[PDB]
Every structure is written in C-alpha cells, then in structure tokens.
Design a protein around this ligand. Structure first.
Ligand SMILES: *Cc1c(COP(=O)(O)O)cnc(C)c1O
Ligand SMILES: *Cc1c(COP(=O)(O)O)cnc(C)c1O
Ligand code: NA
Ligand code: NA
Lengths: 251, 392, 392, 251
C-alpha cells in the first residue's frame, strides 16, 4: 500500500503539515488503549506511531518506560499488540500506522517473519530504535519485501554521509530529531517529521514553517495518559483536546 | 564504516540508536590510536605495575591435587588492587577517556565490583565518576555502595525494569547518548556494542600473556587447558586471548548453572540461551520465548549478566573454546576446598572455574594434565553468603 | 645462655616460667640454623613471591601532595595475600615450625588479622592450627572468626581476664608450655620473649629492603623518612630494619592516640606508658600505678597490643627513631583522604601512619621532603566502622 | 630470719615432711581470706605460699585464674595484700611465709623496694613465677639483701646445668614440679618440695618417700574455696578437714 504517499499528497494539496502522536500499545490496558487510539484518530491524528512493550527500552526516556511498565502490568504481549494492530486497521483503512520497535522483538522469530506479520495486519512502517543505518540491511530489505516502510532517525549530530544514507534507505517519512531539512529534500529523502519536544501547538507550526512535512509528539500523549489514570473518561477528554489543538496548528 | 571488524562471525555488531554511533566511532578511533601510542602503553603499564600490583602471581596448588596426576596453577587476579581482575581494563578505559579529553566517567554495576573499580580508577585519574546501579542491587550491596561513595563516585539507583544489571545498563546508555562529548561510558565487560568487546579484551589480555610466560618458566611448556568463569566474559577472554593461536591449549569457559540447568534457574545463555539483539550486540541471551530479556541467576552476584561476550559465542561456534556450567553447590564446594587446602578465599565467581578444574581432576584421577584456573577475584565478600547457607 | 643477644639496650629479655625456656632456646637455635640455610631462604622466598605476591608495589601518590613540596610513596602491603603485612612472618614461622618437626601451630589474635594469617599459613603448609582469641574479640570479629574456621583453624574463645588480646596471649603461652614438643607458638608481633622480637623483624625486613631498592630506582636516593603505625611493632620494624644504618633516613613510628593522650584513652605505651615486665619481656606497658596491665584503646582494633616491641623502645631511647601519636579523628580523616584522592582504601591501622605524613606535609607545605608510608593493610574491613561514625 | 631452716630442722627431728598449701590473698574477700589462712594454719599447715592477684597470670591454670577474678571483684590490691601479710605475721611468729608473685608487681616500683617491703612485713620467701634463673640476678640479689629466700622452680624438663643453677641460686626450698631429688641433694640445694598434682594424702606420703622434704598443694585448697562460696562456714570446715588429712600423711 501507499498510505504515507497518499497522506502527504493530500496534506500538500491542503497546504498543511501532518501531526503524528505516539502511544504504547496496551497502556494502561488493551481496551482503554483501543479507546485511546480511536480517540487520537477522531481528534485529528494524521498517522500513528505505536510502540510494543519491551523489557529493556534502552532508547526511551522515563515517560515511555513507565508506559511499558503499565502495559506489562496488564499482561500486554507482542502477540496481543498485533491483535490490536489488526483491530485498529479494520476500523481505519487509510491512516498510516507506524510501529516503534526494539531489535530483539523483530529478530526474535525471524526478521522476515516479523515484517510478514506487519504486512498481514496492515502496518505501514517500522522504526527499529536500536538499529542504526549501518546495521539496517537485513531490516530494510525485509521491510521492502513486505511493502513496509523502513523508517530511520536523523539525529542532530548527523553529518552529510548519514543524511545521504537516511535519504536512500528510508521510506514513508524521515524521523527528524533548516540545513538538515533542505539537505534531506536535496537527496529526495522521504518527507521529514519533526520529533522530540513536540508537545505544544506552536511547536507544530514552527516545524511546518521550517520546511518539515509535520511533527511527531514523542511522549506528550503518554504524559496525558499517566496523569489521568484514575479517570479513564477524563483521560480520553484531555487527549481529544490536546490532539485537536496540535492538529489545528498544522493547518 | 569502522576501523576494526565489529563482528566475530555472526556475533557482535553495533546495535545502538543512531544518536550514539558517533560516540562509538570516536571511541574506536581513539583506541586504535592509543594502541599504537608507545606513550599510552608506557603509562598504562606503569599504573598496572606500580598501582595495581602487576604482574600477579601464578600459584601452584599441590595440596589440592595430591594423589592425582593433575597439576593445578591459579592466576592470582584476586591479588590485584581492588580484589578482582576488573581493575586492569578500567585503568585503560580511564586513560582512554583522558586521551579523548573527557573528564567524566559513566558506569553500570550489579554486584558492585565494576562500580568500585570504575570509582577507584576515576579517583586516581581525576575523573568525575557517576555510577548507575539497580535498586535491588543497591539494597543487596550496601558495602560496595559505600565504597564507591567513599571514593567520590556518585551512586545513582535504577528502579526501572527489574532494577538489576540489565536495567542499569540501559540507564547508562541513555545518559551517554546525551553527554558523550564530555563523558565516557566505562562498560564493565567484554560485551556491548563494538568496540567495547575488543577494547576490554585488549585491556585484560595481560592476564593470559603473564600466564604463558609464567607457566613456561615453571613448567617449560604451555598448559593443557586454561579455565575461567564467564559472567560477561572479560576475565575469561583476558586469559584466553594470548592462547587462541596455541591450538594445543584448551580454552574452557564456565557459565553459572545456578540451581541446575533443567530448573531454568541459571545464568548460562551461551550454551542454554537463544541468540538475540540486546545491549547493542547480537549474542546469546537469557530471554522468554517472546523475546523479552530475562535475568541471569547464580549464587554469585557477579555472574548476573543475562548475556555473554560476542567473541566467546564465536569461539564456541568454531570449536576453538568449550563452555560448560557449574552449579551453586559445586561452586560452594570448590570455595570450601580452596580455603581449607590452600588458604586462599576465592570469589564465588572464580569458584565456578575452580570447581570445573576439580571435576576434570576427580573424574579422571590418573589423567596427566597441566591446568590453570583464572582466580578472577577474592572471596572475602562472599564470607557471609557461604556462612548463612552452611548454617541454614 | 643464648646464641643471640636477647636485649636491645635495657629492653626485652626472656621473662617466662622456667618450664618454657627450653622451647625458646630450641626456637632460637632453629632460627639461627634456618637463617644460614640457603634451602630455607629459597623456600621462604618462593612462598613470598609465588603465594603471597611479593614484591609489593611502591605507589607514588601525586594527588595527595599536589600544591606542596612533599613527595609521598606508599609501600603496598595492603596488596599482600591476606590484605596485611602479617602474612610475611607467619609464612616464615610456619616453615620454622616444620624445620623443627612440629605439626601444630598455636596463635593469639585480637582484631583477627593474625588469626587469619596463621590459619592460611597452616592450611597451606599442612599444619593443625588452633587459635586463641578473647571472648570480647570473638563477638566483635565474627567475619575473621568464620574465615579462620573456613581455613580449618580451631578457634578457642578466652573469657578470662578482660577477654581481649592480652588475655589471649596468656592462654597461648599456657598451652605452649605444655605442648611445645609438637606445637609451635606463632606469636603475632615483634614482641614477647626472645627470640620472637628478633625473628619477626627478620621475617618482615623484606618490606624495608624492597622499599630501599624501589625508591632508589624511582628517585635515585633514599627517602627523608619512612613512617609506619605501631601496634605491636612488626610492620614498623619490618620497614625500619634495612634503614637503621642509613643515618640520614628518619624512622617514625606512630602509636594510636585514641580519643587523645590527655584523656587517658589511647594506646601509646612507648611514649605514654611505663616500663614493666609482661608477656615475657621488659618493655613500656599500658598499666595502672599499681602494676596491673591495662588495655590499649584505639578506633582501629589492630593497634590493641597494650605494649610495644623491645627494639622500638631501644631505638627510641638512643634517638635513632622518633615516635608520635595520631588520634581516631586524624586517622579517620587520613582514611577518607586516601579513598577520595588515590582510590585506595587503607586499613584504619595504616591510616595512622598516613595521617602523620599528611601532618608533616600540611604543617610545612613548602618543605621539600621524600616520604614513604608503610600501608600495612587494606581497609575493606573498616568500611562499616567509618560508616557508622560518619553517620552518627 | 631463718624460719625455713628452723622448720625443716624441726621436721627432720620428727621424721616428717612439710605440707604447704597455696591460696590467693583476698579470695574471696579480705576477711574471709584471713579466716581461711588462720584455718589452714590451725589445721596443720607447716608454711604458706600466698599469691597476690595479678591482671595477667600467664603462668597459672583455670582454678587460680578464677581466684584472682574473685579477689579483684572484692577490690583486692597489692597494698591490701601487704596489710594482710602484716596481720598474718603478727598472729603467727614462726610459720614460713612465701609469696608467689608475677614480675611486674615486683618490678613496678623498684625490685629492691619490693623486697624491702617483704622483709618489713615478715615475709620469708618469694617465687617470681615468670622470672627464669637466667633473668633472676636482680631479683635473687635484692631478695638476699633483705633476708628473703629467692625460690626457684625445678621443672621436669630440667637438665644438669639447670639443677646446678637452681641449687646455688635458691634458698628456703626448691619448688619441684628420684634422680632430680638425689641430684639436688648432691648440689646442696635447698630442701625440695613436691608440687603440682598434690591434692590427696597418698601424694604427700609418696613425695616424702621419694626423698622430698614435703609437698605443696598448688591449687587443691583454692578448689575447696570456690566450691563452698555460698557457705563461708562450710568452706572453713572442709579446708580444715583436707589440711589435717594432708598434714597427717607427712608424718
Ligand atoms: C565481575 C566478576 C566476574 C564476571 O565478569 P566477566 O566479565 O565475566 O569476567 C568474574 N569474576 C569476578 C571475581 C568478578 O568480580
Ligand atoms: C595487625 C596490624 C598492625 C599492628 O601490628 P604491628 O605488629 O604493630 O605491625 C598494623 N597494621 C595492620 C594492617 C595490621 O593488620
Ligand atoms: Na552471562
Ligand atoms: Na602497642
């Protein structure tokens, strides 16, 4: 499928950026999680970045670590996450769905099998947090064979050589953490999405003005969740407010 | 690209978030440079000799082998400053950090030994050391915790995850990805992302080089086998390294068998785990059928690394080295035996290696064999542990 | 009559019940014989080198002296097998016992260090070791007690008297007077009846011989002063011995000042006691105006010998050596300072010597001086003690 | 004075051996101790060997060690012991009184002064437990200058040279712990008193038959004391029985 391609084309014809929220699948529970995701979508999310609870997320901060803890507490497993992924796709046919994974979970039962499973449930992209471009060959290849976009992070301390690799290796969108943006477009890199620190409307508009195709809220959404644990209903309400606010800023 | 091969066969690599690659690359390069720098080698040798107490002795244990055709020697790393082999490599890494112009050190520890070593090295070389340690490990290692603080190191508890060594390892990387400009991550074993497995071996290879010269001097020939315990793989590879090209010399690594392999309560991932990708490397892991990383169990806290060095996995796959396991009880017995017959209190970690040598001897009393056990550390720390058990 | 002079000036002698004289005479003679026996020396050197880890390093401590004209070196006996200097002489005494055809060893200990040393030596050389220890000391030294037992030694509590080191010393002599035919009393310090003061010095003099050669190699000249703590006097005399004839080399012994000399709560009999006759020798003692023997107080349990070696008293009287005292707080500070600036945890006993060197430096920052402190042992044992104090 | 000389002469004319009991001064208390000593004498003791409580009696067994503990518990000091020695002499003019001392107590305030004090209170001999003949010069000399008999122990593992020294250096009596006895007489040594193990009548007669001039009960008397601590009266009774029994055996 070409969900990202279609989304960005649609957003360009409407001169607006994309807003992409991240959440951990199964946090704080399967059911509440499915409700959260549908709320994020109804509030205006352009695409999703979903994380699968991993025992040692050595590439995540405090907020997300707690999300995994909450998810594990509810007994969330990768198999259940994939059951959720399927349910989510069945309800929403065009929204791009990207997964944020850790290498072992992808390699565990065969890298190829993992991407075959992603394609089957309707996943659009996969970003393996602990696989640098130098070690991505097996992953991006498997991803391509199953029509999955291999997403790569373009760090700030990146140099020209890295920009060139990210540009030819990545698909769907470039996960960016002025010059970098222009250079990525120079190398025909996938549309760039500003990440990190994205937690307020003004940050979304700033990203779009800089030339990025959108923004990704790496943990703001997770934060709203942990603060409203005692009230599932108020949680969905605040999530709906924040997301519509963030989305509005991309227009 | 890299200067050295990041892989040993299919094992190893550099599986870290993109943001950390520059740190690894810079580190490899400084290492390659330091290894060719005579000045660096002289300074490292000076500290090892005049500060750490190298070379360490090679002790012949006659009482232990009486009545058999086995000759046993123990490489005395238990006599090294700090009481364990870990001191060798932390000294080199600290000089490396200084060579890179870094003034801060970041370290992870479970049993506390590596924390103590990093702290003493930092104190000696004027480095601001901050150490990450799992909350469960803090409670259990009050002594080593006070030692680190006593040496000016900042001890930071890690409550995330299972709050053990693996969880501490993650917090360190997190800190480093954001401060590697001024801080150096002093990993504590021959594992993790390249160039760490390679660097730790080189900074621990004097163990094997000294052992060869010493056995050559006392026996006029190489040993039939060198035996070392394997937690992460640093003392073992340090002993093996210089013998790798000596085909007639058997290399035996010993993983903790815990309560027994069949009980599932052990710490032998190399022979009883499953290959995975964690802590920046492709290596056998202690993990669920699902792919979640599990803890490594053993009566000895120091063999808690839920994985193993890449090179060991490789050396095993080609048949160059053999890996076996020893249970808590076998280690305990070896521990009691050394105290009574040689007057040396071995670390419960090292006791696993000794236990295997004892088995090689006992099972075949009439087999002539020249063995060397790497006594990686002293067991003064295990006195109470062995006490309560024999008491209970 | 005797072969060697039992006196150092007016101090020393052999004040034991008649029944024990033959034991002392036999011992002196075996010693004189062993000192001329190249075979004995070779075997002793072999154990010191391949078992104990000699020679020990001489560490230059630059961080400690920064900003001053003082150069400080530490003789690393803390790196010796056992963690203290005591291992040197127990090894020699055990060989002596074997030379005499004895199969049993008798020893006395307070802090436990000598007990552990005697036990490890006995275990190594196949000797049945029984150790006498004061009941009060047993309670306080549970760790060392289990270590001795772990090494096959029999630990016998002494409830008589004040139940401390002096009371343990009496029970040992009692046992020995009746079994010296098969048992050898392994006294733990450069004190007691002749020939013990002489024998212990000779079996500890490698400390000073190594120090001279090492300082000569690194500085090209002898130190301006060597400094050692003085409990019984074994590590101090061991350091001094080879320098005695070097008049330009100052010899400084440090007695524990406890809570302060003026408080009466100390352990400095050499400079603040009164000559008496006890434990088979004429030497300064901790005693009442009445003549009853009192205990020696100090934050460090190992400086509890309520007297001092005869030769030190003599060296002091002729002005060849100078003796001073350091308080608990001064020792504690020196202890904290070494941990933080050199990454070495010193024994609280040794910390008294370091503390004095620190004072020599601090009081006269611009005085050029080459100092050597004998770091008699490691302080891993004192970790909790220094903890509760800084905590309270 | 020549108390020992007179005693032995008197015992020889009556063809009997001497019985000498030992006790710690001040055990279990000054008063009870003075009563014990007078009881020992009234029961037939020929001479006395009194010990002064010392902090570290490295030359004594369990029994005596406890006696010192009991004595110290009652605050007994050397000065008090000497007050007792004086009281004892005033009541008994001819009985030989020997002291069993430890070197430090004698050396403490000057060896000479110690023996001067012994002479003043009426002491007849002094045996310094931890001073071998090789170190006795200062002691025996001081003892002689004050008419005190320097007593020496003749151990079993003694050789000819030791026998000769003990014979010329000792006075009053030789503290012995067949051949030894004959040799001591050959060298004109002071009359020998068999010590150690002396706790029954038959041992006293055996000592006298062997050629010794008597026996010394090194700790039997002390034992009777510690067993009757709760009954001062029964203590004196048993002491009186044991002593008369022991003395009778020397006749
Ligand atoms: C830390 C430790 C080990 C385990 O580490 P490796 O990296 O496997 O050597 C082994 N022995 C001792 C004494 C240790 O302290
Ligand atoms: C036992 C001890 C001492 C005291 O003994 P000396 O005979 O006075 O040397 C000093 N330092 C250490 C470390 C000791 O263990
Ligand atoms: Na392991
Ligand atoms: Na002393």
């Amino acid at each position: 499928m070409e969900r990202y391609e279609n989304l960005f084309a649609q957003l360009n014809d409407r001169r607006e950026g994309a807003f992409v929220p991240f959440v951990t699948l199964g946090d704080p529970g399967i059911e509440q999680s499915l409700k959260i995701i549908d709320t994020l979508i109804d509030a205006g999310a352009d695409a999703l970045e979903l994380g699968v609870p991993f025992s040692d997320p050595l590439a995540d901060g405090p907020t997300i670590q707690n999300a995994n803890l909450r998810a594990f507490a509810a007994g969330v497993t990768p198999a259940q996450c994939f059951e959720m992924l399927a349910l989510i796709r069945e309800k929403h046919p065009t929204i791009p769905i990207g997964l944020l994974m850790y290498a072992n979970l992808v390699f565990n039962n065969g890298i190829d099998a993992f991407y075959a499973r992603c394609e089957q449930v309707g996943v659009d992209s996969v970003l393996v947090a602990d696989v640098p471009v130098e070690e991505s060959a097996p992953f991006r290849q498997a991803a391509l064979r199953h029509n999955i976009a291999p997403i790569f992070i373009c760090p700030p301390n990146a140099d020209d050589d890295l920009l060139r690799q990210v540009a030819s290796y990545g698909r769907g969108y470039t996960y960016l953490l002025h010059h970098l943006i222009e250079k990525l477009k120079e190398y025909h890199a996938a549309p760039a999405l500003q990440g990190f620190g994205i937690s307020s409307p003004e940050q979304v508009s700033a990203a779009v003005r800089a030339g990025a195709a959108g923004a990704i809220s790496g943990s703001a959404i997770v934060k709203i969740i942990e603060k409203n644990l005692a009230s599932p209903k108020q949680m969905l309400a605040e999530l709906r407010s924040f997301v519509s606010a963030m989305k509005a800023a991309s227009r | 690209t890299t200067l050295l091969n990041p892989y040993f066969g299919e094992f190893g690599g550099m599986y870290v978030p993109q943001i950390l690659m520059p740190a690894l690359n810079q580190l490899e390069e400084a290492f390659v440079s330091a290894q060719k720098d005579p000045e660096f080698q002289a300074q490292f040798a000076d500290l090892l000799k005049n500060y750490a107490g190298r070379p360490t002795a090679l002790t012949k244990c006659q009482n232990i082998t009486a009545g058999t055709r086995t000759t046993l020697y123990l490489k005395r790393e238990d006599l090294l400053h700090g009481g364990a082999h870990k001191t060798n490599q932390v000294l080199g890494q600290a000089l490396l950090a200084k060579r890179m112009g870094k003034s801060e050190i970041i370290a992870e520890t479970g049993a506390g030994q590596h924390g103590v070593a990093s702290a003493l090295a930092s104190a000696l070389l004027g480095l601001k050391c901050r150490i990450y340690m799992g909350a469960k490990d803090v409670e259990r290692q009050s002594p080593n915790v006070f030692r680190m603080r006593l040496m000016g190191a900042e001890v930071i508890p890690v409550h995330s995850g299972s709050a053990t060594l693996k969880d501490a390892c993650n917090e360190a990387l997190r800190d480093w990805s954001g401060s590697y400009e001024t801080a150096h991550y002093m990993l504590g074993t021959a594992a993790g992302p390249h160039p760490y497995p390679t660097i730790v071996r080189e900074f621990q290879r004097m163990i094997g080089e000294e052992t060869k010269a010493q056995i050559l001097d006392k026996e006029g020939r190489l040993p039939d086998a060198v035996i070392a315990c394997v937690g992460g793989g640093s003392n073992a590879i340090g002993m093996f390294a210089d013998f790798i090209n000596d085909t007639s010399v058997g290399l035996i690594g010993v993983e903790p068998g815990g309560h027994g392999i069949e009980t599932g309560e052990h710490g032998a991932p190399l022979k009883h785990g499953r290959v995975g990708i964690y802590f920046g490397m492709k290596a056998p892991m202690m993990q669920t059928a699902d792919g979640q990383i599990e803890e490594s169990y053993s009566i000895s806290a120091g063999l808690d690394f839920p994985s193993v060095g890449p090179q060991h996995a490789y050396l095993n796959s080609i048949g160059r080295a053999d890996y076996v396991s020893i249970t808590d009880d076998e280690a305990l017995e070896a521990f009691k035996t050394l105290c009574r017959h040689e007057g040396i209190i071995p670390a419960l970690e090292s006791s696993h290696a000794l236990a295997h040598a004892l088995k090689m001897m006992r099972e075949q009393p009439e087999k002539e064999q020249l063995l060397v056990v790497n006594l990686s550390g002293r067991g003064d720390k295990d006195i109470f542990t062995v006490h309560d058990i024999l008491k209970a």
